[PDB]
Paper text:
Chromophore formation of [name] ([name]) is a built-in type of posttranslational modification, i.e., the chromophore of [name] forms by an autocatalytic reaction of the backbone involving cyclization, oxidation, and dehydration reactions. For recombinant expression and purification of [name] ([name]), one of the variants of [name], [name], was used in this study. Here, we demonstrated that the second posttranslational modification is generated at the side chain of the C-terminal Lys238 residue of the [name], a mutant of [name], when over-expressed in E. coli BL21 (DE3) pLysS strain. We determined the crystal structures of [name] form I and form II at 1.65 Å and 1.28 Å resolution, respectively.
Furthermore, the mass spectrum of the H231GMDELYK238 fragment ions from [name] form II was also better matched to the theoretical mass spectrum of the fragment containing the Lys238 converted to 6-hydroxynorleucine, in terms of the isotope pattern of ions. The results of the mass spectrometric analysis, described above, indicated that the mass increase of ~1 Da in [name] form II is most likely caused by the conversion of an amino group into a hydroxyl group occurred in the side chain of Lys238 residue at the C terminus. The mass spectrometric data supports that the conversion of an amino group into a hydroxyl group occurs in the ε-amino group of the Lys238 residue. This modification causes a decrease in the net charge of the modified form of [name] (named form II) from that of the unmodified [name] (form I) at the neutral pH. In addition, the charge difference occurs on the molecular surface, not the interior of the β-barrel structure, because the Lys238 residue locates on the solvent accessible α-helix. The C-terminal α-helices of [name] form I and form II also show almost the same structure in each other, except for the slight differences in the side chains of the C-terminal residue and the adjacent Glu235, where the electron densities at the end of the substituent groups in form II are more disordered than those in form I. The overall structures of [name] form I and form II are almost identical when these are superposed, showing 0.145 Å rmsd for Cα atoms of 233 residues, though slight differences arise mainly in the conformations of the turns consisting of Asn23–Gly24 and Asp155–Lys158. The regions around the chromophore of both forms show almost the same structure, although the alternative conformers of the side chains of His148 and Thr203 could be modeled in [name] form I and form II, respectively. The fluorescent properties, the overall structure as well as the structure in the vicinity of chromophore are almost the same in [name] form I and form II, although their chemical composition at the C-termini is different. These seem to be due to the fact that the modification site is ~30 Å away from the chromophore.
Residue numbers in the entry: 4 to 64, 68 to 237
Amino acid sequence: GEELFTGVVPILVELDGDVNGHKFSVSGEGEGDATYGKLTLKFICTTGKLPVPWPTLVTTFVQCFSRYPDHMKRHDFFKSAMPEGYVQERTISFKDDGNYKTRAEVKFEGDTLVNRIELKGIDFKEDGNILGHKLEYNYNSHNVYITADKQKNGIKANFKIRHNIEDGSVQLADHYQQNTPIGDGPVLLPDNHYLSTQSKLSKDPNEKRDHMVLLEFVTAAGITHGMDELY
Ligand SMILES: *N[C@@H](CCCCO)C(=O)O
């Protein structure tokens, strides 16, 4: 599977969502270059205005594009599941507000890596930071710890995303994530490690539709003692 990621790979993201009486769809396109852990993606809301803030969907919108160091190649579950792919399921709980439930399948369709997502939003406050669009349009860097779930033949992660709010506070979005292979081909089940992520959000000055431009870099890390010994 890792052979499929040696070059630049086109990406398609499709999300079907339902939150607070609003059905919405998002399509995203761009490319990933796993050699540098680099993602360049532009998302468009094709149904009108997005009924939740763009930053709340960044994690939902392809960790197979993470840069795994040579010394950590045996820990890359995500690429090992390719091309048949993996299911990624999350609960995202917004502190003192509602939650997202997401299920995605990530797999190749020919040369294109496709992330197809179903999202449901539950129990949000009409006046809250999410439905009230009170999040700043920016994004923090996070370290996501990955552990094996070997009886389920996959991996899991839980992590809290920090969203800056326009009132100067920071609202946490608590993520619980599980990934399972779609195919029956053996996958790599990793030792504990983490993914170091950084994301920049911007706008296309020629785009009339509601949209988000995302530039993201992800690097696997945390396995250091063996390499440190060399020096
Ligand atoms: N590279 C050092 C050893 C690192 C000490 C911790 O492993 C050296 O060559 O002396």
